[PDB]
Design a protein around this nucleic acid. Structure first.
Ligand code: MG
Ligand code: MG
Ligand code: MG
Ligand code: MG
Ligand code: MG
Length: 195
RNA sequence: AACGGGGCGCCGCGGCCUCUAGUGUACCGGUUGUCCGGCAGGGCACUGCCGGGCAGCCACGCCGUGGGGGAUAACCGCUGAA
């Protein structure tokens, strides 16, 4: 379809300061300062016109096709996620599932390490990025907290994918005659806010 | 079974000659037949033949011969609207 003009509005919440700066012909840099910290995002080569209006961010498209009109909801969702990150934060939870070999997960510094995964002598080591806090709850839960939902979710995805094997090392998901197979690893169980 | 850790080959490539092996009509010795009168020394038998063998060359000998980064393929995921 074709759109002569479309507009969307994201209401800025209390205590959150938004700055929008034009760094190019169609580029934007957005800074969101909240109680929990600061978030910075870039929107490059975009048809969406972003502006500020008395506590709201206005997103506008003029003479847009479907591919340009779809960007309004995406930018709205990104801005809402940034606001919720600076206000309440983000906290992703992961579960540690083992069948015979317990997987010792530990956070030392900005390395997170998994030992004894399936009895492997090798140890999985992951570099925790800036602005992500990793905590190990008991022998079964992992918590990743931050103010960037994309960064926190990406790190949780990396943690889950570290325990998934590929190639010839991939074990059979199901057992003999249809039972459960060797399903061992760390599974992202969900998300919530810090506050 | 596997990841991970330790050890070593085979194939190829590039060098080297210390060792070992080959050659080595440089060199040294033994010996057959005949000629130089005999001994000695020697000619020829196309090194006469046999044994050893420096240097050099050489392999059948020795030495070196790697991890990493980037963008990616097949795809696997995060966020995410229409
Ligand atoms: Mg060679
Ligand atoms: Mg000889
Ligand atoms: Mg004589
Ligand atoms: Mg004569
Ligand atoms: Mg002769």
């Amino acid at each position: 379809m074709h759109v002569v003009y479309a507009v969307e509005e994201v209401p800025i919440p209390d205590g959150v300061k938004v700055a929008i700066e034009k760094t190019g012909p169609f580029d934007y840099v957005v800074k969101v300062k909240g109680p929990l910290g600061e978030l910075v995002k870039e929107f490059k080569n975009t048809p969406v016109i972003m502006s500020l209006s008395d506590g709201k961010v206005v997103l506008e498209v003029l003479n847009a096709k479907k591919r340009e009109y779809a960007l309004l909801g995406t930018y709205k969702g990104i801005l809402k996620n940034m606001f919720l990150g600076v206000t309440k934060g983000w906290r992703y939870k992961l579960k540690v599932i083992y069948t015979h070999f317990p997987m010792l997960v530990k956070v030392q510094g900005n390395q997170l390490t998994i030992e004894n995964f399936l009895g492997r002598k090798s140890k999985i080591v992951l570099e925790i990025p800036k602005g992500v806090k990793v905590e190990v709850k008991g022998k079964e839960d992992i918590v990743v907290e931050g103010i960037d939902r994309e960064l926190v979710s990406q790190f949780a995805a990396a943690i889950q994918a570290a325990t998934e094997l590929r190639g010839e090392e991939k074990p059979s998901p199901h057992g003999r005659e249809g039972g459960l197979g060797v399903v061992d690893g760390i599974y992202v169980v969900g998300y919530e806010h810090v506050k």
